[PDB]
Design a protein around this motif. Structure first.
Motif, PDB file in Angstrom:
ATOM      1  N   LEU A 127       8.058 -21.270   4.873  1.00 35.35           N
ATOM      2  CA  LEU A 127       8.455 -19.857   4.684  1.00 35.35           C
ATOM      3  C   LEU A 127       8.701 -19.447   3.168  1.00 35.35           C
ATOM      4  O   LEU A 127       8.576 -18.367   2.672  1.00 35.35           O
ATOM      5  N   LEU A 130       5.180 -19.502   1.162  1.00 36.12           N
ATOM      6  CA  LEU A 130       4.418 -18.233   1.627  1.00 36.12           C
ATOM      7  C   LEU A 130       4.875 -17.181   1.270  1.00 36.12           C
ATOM      8  O   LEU A 130       4.267 -16.162   0.612  1.00 36.12           O
ATOM      9  N   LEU A 131       6.218 -16.675   1.399  1.00 31.47           N
ATOM     10  CA  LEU A 131       6.868 -15.417   1.101  1.00 31.47           C
ATOM     11  C   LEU A 131       6.721 -15.246  -0.558  1.00 31.47           C
ATOM     12  O   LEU A 131       6.359 -14.062  -1.115  1.00 31.47           O
ATOM     13  N   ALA A 134       3.089 -14.401  -1.335  1.00 31.89           N
ATOM     14  CA  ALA A 134       2.759 -12.903  -0.979  1.00 31.89           C
ATOM     15  C   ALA A 134       3.281 -12.295  -2.355  1.00 31.89           C
ATOM     16  O   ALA A 134       2.616 -11.262  -2.607  1.00 31.89           O
ATOM     17  N   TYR A 138       1.142  -9.557  -4.423  1.00 34.45           N
ATOM     18  CA  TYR A 138       1.256  -8.180  -4.365  1.00 34.45           C
ATOM     19  C   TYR A 138       1.532  -7.430  -5.713  1.00 34.45           C
ATOM     20  O   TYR A 138       1.200  -6.428  -6.064  1.00 34.45           O
ATOM     21  N   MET A 305     -10.962 -15.235 -10.122  1.00 29.21           N
ATOM     22  CA  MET A 305     -11.118 -13.565 -10.058  1.00 29.21           C
ATOM     23  C   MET A 305      -9.648 -13.139  -9.796  1.00 29.21           C
ATOM     24  O   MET A 305      -8.658 -13.664  -9.349  1.00 29.21           O
ATOM     25  N   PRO A 308      -8.513  -6.126  -8.412  1.00 31.46           N
ATOM     26  CA  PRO A 308      -8.449  -5.215  -9.601  1.00 31.46           C
ATOM     27  C   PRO A 308      -7.397  -3.792  -9.488  1.00 31.46           C
ATOM     28  O   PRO A 308      -7.218  -3.203 -10.425  1.00 31.46           O
ATOM     29  N   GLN A 437     -15.343 -12.827  -2.049  1.00 30.66           N
ATOM     30  CA  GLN A 437     -15.086 -11.714  -2.929  1.00 30.66           C
ATOM     31  C   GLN A 437     -14.770 -10.570  -1.946  1.00 30.66           C
ATOM     32  O   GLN A 437     -13.910  -9.790  -2.253  1.00 30.66           O
ATOM     33  N   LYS A 438     -15.677 -10.345  -0.937  1.00 30.47           N
ATOM     34  CA  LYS A 438     -15.571  -9.190  -0.247  1.00 30.47           C
ATOM     35  C   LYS A 438     -14.512  -9.144   0.793  1.00 30.47           C
ATOM     36  O   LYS A 438     -13.709  -8.129   0.922  1.00 30.47           O
ATOM     37  N   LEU A 439     -13.983 -10.429   1.327  1.00 26.01           N
ATOM     38  CA  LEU A 439     -12.795 -10.711   2.237  1.00 26.01           C
ATOM     39  C   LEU A 439     -11.435 -10.536   1.295  1.00 26.01           C
ATOM     40  O   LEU A 439     -10.607 -10.533   2.047  1.00 26.01           O
ATOM     41  N   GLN A 441     -11.325  -8.863  -1.791  1.00 26.22           N
ATOM     42  CA  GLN A 441     -11.657  -7.630  -2.704  1.00 26.22           C
ATOM     43  C   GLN A 441     -11.054  -7.955  -4.148  1.00 26.22           C
ATOM     44  O   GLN A 441     -10.092  -7.736  -4.698  1.00 26.22           O
ATOM     45  N   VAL A 443     -12.682  -9.359  -8.295  1.00 30.96           N
ATOM     46  CA  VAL A 443     -13.663  -9.173  -9.225  1.00 30.96           C
ATOM     47  C   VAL A 443     -13.386 -10.198 -10.533  1.00 30.96           C
ATOM     48  O   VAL A 443     -12.239 -10.601 -10.710  1.00 30.96           O
TER      49      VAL A 443
END
Ligand SMILES: *[C@@H]1O[C@H](CO)[C@@H](O)[C@H](O)[C@H]1NC(C)=O
Ligand SMILES: *[C@@H]1O[C@H](CO)[C@@H](O)[C@H](O)[C@H]1NC(C)=O
Ligand SMILES: *[C@@H]1O[C@H](CO)[C@@H](O)[C@H](O)[C@H]1NC(C)=O
Ligand SMILES: *[C@@H]1O[C@H](CO)[C@@H](O)[C@H](O)[C@H]1NC(C)=O
Lengths: 447, 217, 220, 469
Positions: A127, A130-131, A134, A138, A305, A308, A437-439, A441, A443
């Protein structure tokens, strides 16, 4: 100024390992008198290690850590095997160890006598990782503030233990094992707490300007660390029995439960926060190795990557994190410290061997610092001593670790050296990449 | 566990003479703290239970004749009989009692030697009741001889018979130290009908010529 | 007096359990532990284990652990050995024995043994056939008489002559096993004055099928 | 390399990837709150630690009695300042306690010339007493003083006017507590009229001073019922007695003497001792001394030894000396009255060197009893492990569990432990670590197979084994 340089390096070196490892050195050294000698010996080994890294951190100077040196000294396969060891062994295992000390100390006041249930310690370790993964995904603008703050808790808890130790003396030994086998595991446990200097020591050169003043910052600071580590161990040994300190997975909570009465709100909190800071720090500073390792072409292009809108290096964090979380399959915290220590010191061996082979092969390469050869020729042998004993004192951990190393040779050939030409394979690799890249997002960074 | 070798397996000896059994243990059975040796001897006469003779190597049980003397220490132990009587033929076992579970020797068979004697030989025609069964059994008894070695010939109208013959010796008789032996021949009723004269003849080392008995139906 | 006694004989179909039983008398039953010892033919005594009647604790040799099971009944001074999974090589005589000191293993008092035979062949009562000399019988001063015992099972059959009165001059020959049935014979010698003048019987007795038979030895 | 920013900014078509990435971001927080709930369930249903009992100092290991200061030292040095020298030995024995046999000014059988407050000057001065007592505090040896009045006489409470004698004591306890002693021994309470009432008064006086002081009574009794009666009204009295003394002299009764007494008292605190005063070797034959030290250090309660129990001293072995007060054999000089009679192995110096020696066993056990939470105040379960064996497990909630196996009978076992009917909480392992044996020639530290273990006659074992949830 030099005095403010020392206040940067001592706060970098002190770490969270000091809250794990007292029990470790005491278990192997048998009785307090030899445990304090091992703490000093680990100090002295760190002084010799740090000054060799003052040399490599100013001669080659390429950014990214040891891998950046391996590109010059060896290139090719050994450079990839350093990166592979550091991302699958070293940086995972040292995160899991600090995530698990966090978990035991956060839980220990609910389980004052009886040992805290391992199935819960491992969930609370996860825990935490992971926290903090994240939070680093973010916002770098948040995760920097989380690092800026809890560096205070690290020193506040560690000083409080010493001042409580002094009032214990104000109100107020044999070395019962001496096997070379055990004393190398005592050294591994004690050296773990100093384990900052190989990653970051060069940072001080960007504020301490003269190259001869960087050795002074080392030679002043590591005795200060050694002093703090010896004094905290005296604070325990002047309050607790050997037969208590070997029983408790979180020894400073035992000590805090003896003195404070308000115990629950002090040592568990301040030490917990220091480890929450140390897990956060190891995530935040990880990206550098992925950027460098992909720029120099060893590491898959997706792990370079960034997302963005937030400028946070999401695929590198998620890989770092999931490697840390697999160490939940290990048995015991001192198992993992032995494992980490073997490969950590084996990597430092390859680096300092490298430095002497380079001093031979390319003489007078404009070195701003040049240490006496008499230091590395003891230090290399000290790295070899620890490894050579450990092959037979702890075989099974080395076996699974060398299984990881040998599993690097396939992905070196397939990923870097053989450069497999089939167009279906390359389109498969590309399809897998753009899916990620798509999953997520994400670059490329600005080249 | 401890293991107790015992020897000799047989000890044939004459009445009145002194005899010795040896027992030999795979560990010491001296208890250092107490200076006695944990061993016992049991006599087991044919057809009865073990009787305890001596224990702690030497201590005679009550109701034991004083001709049994036990002796030894450490691992060499010996039961001795000062003057063997005819009543003494038996197997003798040594047992340790230094650990529980205890363990025993495979036992020494004491046998008696006496002046050789020829068998009383007798032969019995089939029982008139047995003839109802469709079979018949002819039986020859050889009583009170020494030594044990003997052989028997069955003759039937002069023909020598070697199918369907059985023998059984007694254990040696404790009153007189003689053996005895039964010999048996089993026939169908029609096999007993077709032949007239039945002979049992016994060769024993006390005579050059066989002893003979016979009957005619 | 101290006296342990046991059933004489048991037949067991291979793989089955059996209970062998030992009733003490002549002493305070809870004061002394009870041991079970076995005697495989031609292979020496072997000790199973022992039981304390005061609390039913029992201690067993490594060879029997879980294969045997001792219990006890304080209301009758009886000790019971269950044995289980019996093979042909567990055919033996089983002896109940008492210690001298309270549990130490040396055995002054033994029960007469229970002969346990492990075989699929069925219980078969004996057929008894008397033997009398026939021709020229009275031509000698002493005359021999006999008793064939045929086709019986299991092993233990007993013969005594004239209800144990003729305990002098009797030879009973060990049994011979044929087609999974035993054969045995018994013999006695008496004065030539006695036999035609008096009763003579082999009192054949068989514990395992309860038959008792007194065939008279009548002349031809 | 790969698909660039300038492409990906239009490949994010809302019905596919944007809704998908919302779903995975919610799945992560749902899954991490799942793992938080999982961990909180485990921490709620995991079994909580049993609280520690608050343990008085005399729970934490052995007391040690010194019935005559002179006999413990040799003459001339027979004074309290001499004793101040010896406490490094006592600290080696790890004895949490001391009991100085009476030092008060007693004149034989004279009620009036006897005082319990002024010390008998042969032993020193109160200034010596305090110097000792402060040294003992410094070295963590609490000191009890023995106040039995007529200790140079025949009858220790005198024959007459007992209430005046009790009055002497009532005053004495207050004084010596003020002087700083940690408690009091009194002896021969079968020779005291109205014994239970005086013990109740003195106990009230002592506990009324402080909760960390004790009164050790002692009686010549070996009757379970008489003892239980003295312990009925008084509930934190240690009462040493002859009760275990009548052992059957090949141990045979002990499993039963011990477990009846625990059962009868209801598993309160006890003080195990073969007597109120005399040595172990006054009662035990010398093959059992090791076996009893293994047991006295591992039953529930505070063991008590007289001086030289730790070396198997024996009054008979050096003839002439009194069975009250045998001369302690520090080294080969120590009994010069018949020189050459003392063998090296009989002496503290001669044992201290030898891992096989009695004192190397005492020292080793004294460690375990004073450190290990399981021996310090664990539960106790006897079980039938084997024919001779007194066998029992000491345990506490999750710490290390200790099985003791004493083979009191003179016949070795050859077929393991074979435990009938263990408590379901306390089941034996398949194997357990031999921490020590009473006998040499064992692989100490190694795990043993309990179903195939082999005890020798009189071999006691201390096995250690870890918990199971
Ligand atoms: C004895 O002490 C108890 C408290 O431990 C108290 O209840 C009782 O009244 C006291 N009695 C006397 C006479 O001191
Ligand atoms: C204990 O004291 C009583 C009373 O004086 C006496 O009768 C008894 O014999 C004594 N017993 C022992 C063992 O000293
Ligand atoms: C003693 O132990 C037995 C054990 O079953 C128990 O029933 C009994 O209540 C205990 N107490 C007394 C005083 O007998
Ligand atoms: C000590 O050594 C002596 C002399 O060798 C020996 O006779 C004796 O048995 C040993 N033990 C004791 C306790 O005296």
């Amino acid at each position: 100024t030099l005095l403010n340089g020392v206040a940067i390096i001592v706060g970098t070196i002190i770490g969270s390992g000091i809250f794990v490892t007292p029990t470790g050195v005491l278990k192997e050294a048998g009785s307090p008198g030899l445990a304090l000698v091992v703490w000093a010996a680990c100090g002295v080994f760190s002084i010799v290690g740090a000054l060799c890294y003052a040399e490599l951190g100013t001669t080659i100077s390429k950014s990214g850590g040891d891998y950046a040196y391996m590109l010059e000294v060896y290139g090719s396969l050994p450079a990839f095997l350093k990166l592979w060891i550091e991302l699958l062994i070293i940086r995972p295992s040292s995160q899991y160890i600090v995530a698990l000390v966090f978990a035991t100390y956060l839980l220990k006041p609910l389980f004052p006598t009886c040992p805290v249930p391992e199935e819960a310690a491992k969930l609370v370790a996860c825990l935490c990782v992971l926290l903090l993964t994240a939070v680093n995904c973010y916002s770098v603008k948040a995760a920097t503030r989380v690092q800026d703050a809890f560096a205070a808790a690290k020193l506040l808890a560690l000083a409080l233990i010493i001042l409580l130790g002094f009032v214990q003396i104000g109100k107020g030994f044999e070395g019962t094992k001496l096997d070379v086998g055990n004393i190398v595991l005592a050294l591994y446990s004690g050296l773990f707490a100093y384990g900052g200097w190989n990653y970051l020591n060069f940072v001080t050169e960007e504020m301490i300007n003269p190259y001869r003043n960087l050795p002074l910052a080392i030679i002043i600071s590591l005795p200060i660390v050694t002093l703090v580590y010896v004094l905290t161990n005296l604070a325990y040994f002047t309050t607790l029995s050997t037969e208590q300190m070997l029983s408790s997975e979180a020894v400073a909570v035992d000590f805090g439960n003896y003195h404070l009465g308000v115990m629950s709100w002090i040592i568990p909190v301040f030490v917990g926060l220091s480890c929450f800071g140390s897990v956060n720090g190891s995530l935040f500073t990880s990206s550098r190795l992925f950027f460098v390792g992909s720029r120099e072409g060893h590491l898959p292009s997706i792990l370079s990557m960034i997302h963005p809108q937030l400028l946070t290096p999401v695929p590198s964090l998620v890989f770092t994190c999931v490697m840390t979380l697999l160490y939940a399959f290990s048995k015991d915290i001192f198992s993992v410290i032995n494992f980490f220590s073997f490969f950590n010191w084996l990597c430092v061996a390859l680096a300092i061997i490298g430095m002497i082979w380079l001093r031979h092969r390319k003489p007078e390469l404009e070195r701003p610092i040049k240490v006496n050869l008499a230091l590395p020729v003891f230090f290399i042998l000290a790295c070899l001593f620890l490894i050579a004993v450990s092959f037979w004192k702890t075989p099974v951990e080395c076996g699974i670790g060398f299984t990881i190393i040998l599993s690097g040779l396939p992905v070196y050939f397939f990923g870097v050296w053989w450069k497999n030409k089939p167009k279906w394979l390359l389109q498969g690799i590309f399809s897998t990449t753009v899916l990620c890249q798509k999953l997520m997002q994400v670059v490329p960074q600005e080249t | 566990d401890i293991v107790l070798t015992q020897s000799p397996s047989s000890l044939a000896m004459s009445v009145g003479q002194k005899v010795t059994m040896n027992c030999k243990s795979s560990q010491s059975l001296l208890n250092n703290n107490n200076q006695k040796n944990y061993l016992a001897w049991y006599q087991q006469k044919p057809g009865q239970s073990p009787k305890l003779l001596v224990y702690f190597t030497s201590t005679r049980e009550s109701g034991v004749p004083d001709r049994f003397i036990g002796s030894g220490s450490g691992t060499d132990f010996t039961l001795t009989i000062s003057s063997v009587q005819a009543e003494d033929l038996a197997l003798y076992y040594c047992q340790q009692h230094y650990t529980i579970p205890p363990t025993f020797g495979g036992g020494t068979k004491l046998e008696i030697k006496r002046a050789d004697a020829a068998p009383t030989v007798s032969i019995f025609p089939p029982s008139s009741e047995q003839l109802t069964s469709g079979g018949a059994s002819v039986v020859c008894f050889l009583n009170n001889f020494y030594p044990k070695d003997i052989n028997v010939k069955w003759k039937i109208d002069g023909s020598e018979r070697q199918n369907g013959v059985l023998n059984s010796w007694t254990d040696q008789d404790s009153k007189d130290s003689t053996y005895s032996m039964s010999s048996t021949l089993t026939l169908t009723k029609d096999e007993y009908e077709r032949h007239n004269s039945y002979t049992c003849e016994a060769t024993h080392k006390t005579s050059t010529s066989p002893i003979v008995k016979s009957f005619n139906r | 007096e101290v006296q342990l006694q046991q059933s004489g004989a048991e037949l067991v179909k291979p793989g089955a359990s059996v209970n062998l039983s030992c009733k003490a008398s002549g002493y305070t039953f809870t004061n002394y532990w009870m041991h079970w010892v076995r005697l495989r033919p031609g292979q020496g005594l072997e000790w199973i284990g022992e039981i304390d009647p005061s609390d039913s604790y029992s201690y067993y040799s490594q060879n029997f652990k879980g294969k045997a099971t001792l219990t006890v009944d304080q209301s009758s001074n009886t000790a019971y050995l269950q044995l289980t999974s019996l093979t042909s090589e567990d055919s033996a005589v089983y002896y109940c024995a008492r210690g001298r000191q309270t549990y130490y293993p040396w055995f002054p008092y033994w029960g007469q043994g229970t002969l346990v035979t492990v075989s699929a062949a069925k219980t078969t009562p004996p057929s008894d056939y008397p033997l009398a000399p026939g021709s020229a019988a009275q031509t000698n001063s002493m005359v021999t008489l006999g008793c064939l015992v045929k086709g019986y099972f299991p092993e233990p059959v007993t013969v005594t002559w004239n209800s144990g009165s003729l305990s002098s001059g009797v030879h009973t020959f060990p049994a011979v096993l044929q087609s999974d049935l035993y054969t045995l014979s018994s013999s006695v010698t008496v004065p030539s004055s006695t036999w035609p003048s008096e009763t003579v019987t082999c009192n054949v007795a068989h514990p395992a099928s309860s038959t008792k038979v007194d065939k008279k030895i009548v002349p031809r | 390399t790969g698909l660039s920013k300038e492409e990906l900014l239009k490949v994010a078509g809302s019905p596919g990837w944007v809704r998908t990435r919302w779903a995975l971001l919610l799945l992560f927080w749902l899954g991490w709150l799942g793992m938080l709930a999982g961990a909180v369930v485990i921490i709620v249903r995991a079994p909580r630690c049993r609280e520690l009992p608050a343990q008085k100092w005399w729970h934490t290991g052995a007391l040690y009695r010194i019935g005559d200061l002179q006999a413990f030292q040799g003459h001339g040095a027979g004074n309290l300042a001499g004793l101040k020298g010896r406490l490094d030995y006592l600290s080696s024995l790890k004895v949490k306690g001391l009991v100085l046999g009476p030092i008060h000014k007693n004149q034989k059988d004279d009620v009036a010339q006897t005082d319990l407050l002024q010390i008998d000057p042969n032993f020193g001065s109160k200034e010596d007493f305090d110097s000792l007592l402060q040294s003992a505090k410094k070295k963590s040896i609490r000191v009890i003083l023995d106040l039995t009045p007529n200790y140079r006489g025949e009858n220790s409470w005198f024959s007459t006017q007992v209430d005046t004698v009790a009055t002497k004591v009532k005053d004495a306890l207050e004084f010596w507590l003020q002087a700083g002693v940690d408690g009091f021994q009194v002896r021969d309470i079968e020779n005291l009229k109205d014994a239970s009432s005086f013990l109740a008064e003195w106990q009230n006086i002592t506990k009324g001073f402080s909760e960390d002081r004790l009164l050790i009574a002692g009686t010549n009794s070996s009757d379970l019922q008489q003892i239980l009666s003295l312990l009925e009204s008084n509930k934190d009295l240690l009462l040493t007695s002859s009760y275990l003394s009548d052992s059957g002299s090949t141990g045979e009764h002990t499993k039963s003497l011990v477990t009846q007494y625990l059962n009868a008292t209801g598993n309160r605190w006890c003080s195990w001792s073969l007597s109120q005063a005399r040595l172990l070797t006054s009662f035990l034959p010398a093959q059992l001394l090791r076996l009893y030290q293994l047991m006295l250090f591992t039953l529930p309660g505070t063991p008590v030894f007289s001086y030289g129990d730790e070396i198997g001293l024996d009054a008979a072995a050096l003839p002439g000396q009194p069975m009250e007060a045998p001369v302690m054999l520090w080294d080969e000089s120590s009994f010069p009255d018949i020189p050459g009679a003392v063998s090296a192995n009989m002496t503290v110096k001669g044992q201290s060197e030898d891992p096989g020696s009695l004192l190397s066993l005492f020292r080793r056990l004294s460690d375990q009893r004073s450190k290990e939470r399981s021996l310090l105040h664990g539960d106790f379960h006897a079980f039938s492990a084997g024919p001779g064996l007194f066998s029992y497990i000491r345990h506490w909630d999750q710490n290390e569990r200790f099985l003791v196996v004493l083979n009191f009978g003179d016949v070795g076992l050859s077929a393991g432990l074979q435990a009938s009917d263990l408590p379901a909480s306390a089941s034996l392992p398949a194997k357990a670590d031999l921490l020590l044996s009473t006998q040499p020639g064992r692989e100490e530290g190694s795990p043993l197979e309990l179903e195939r273990l082999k005890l020798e006659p009189h071999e006691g074992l201390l096995l250690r084994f870890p918990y199971a949830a």
